[PDB]
């Protein structure tokens, strides 16, 4: 595979969360806005909740 987007890894900061970081499908029902609002979500949810289409699911 070598690797996939994950979300922890750019929290150095230095990329600045809710407003521009275009839009996507996260795995349970939902287009999510920005990849910091995505990446929040992901922390609490069960184990393993990732993004596969860009825009609209």
């Given at each position: 595979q070598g690797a996939q987007?994950?979300?922890a890894?750019?929290?150095d900061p230095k990329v600045y969360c809710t407003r521009e970081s275009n839009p996507h499908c996260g795995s349970n029902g939902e287009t999510y806005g920005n990849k910091c609002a995505?990446?929040?979500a992901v922390?609490?949810?069960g184990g393993k909740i990732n993004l596969k289409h860009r825009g609209k699911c």
């Amino acid at each position: 595979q070598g690797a996939q987007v994950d979300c922890a890894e750019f929290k150095d900061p230095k990329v600045y969360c809710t407003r521009e970081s275009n839009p996507h499908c996260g795995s349970n029902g939902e287009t999510y806005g920005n990849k910091c609002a995505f990446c929040k979500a992901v922390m609490k949810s069960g184990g393993k909740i990732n993004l596969k289409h860009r825009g609209k699911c």
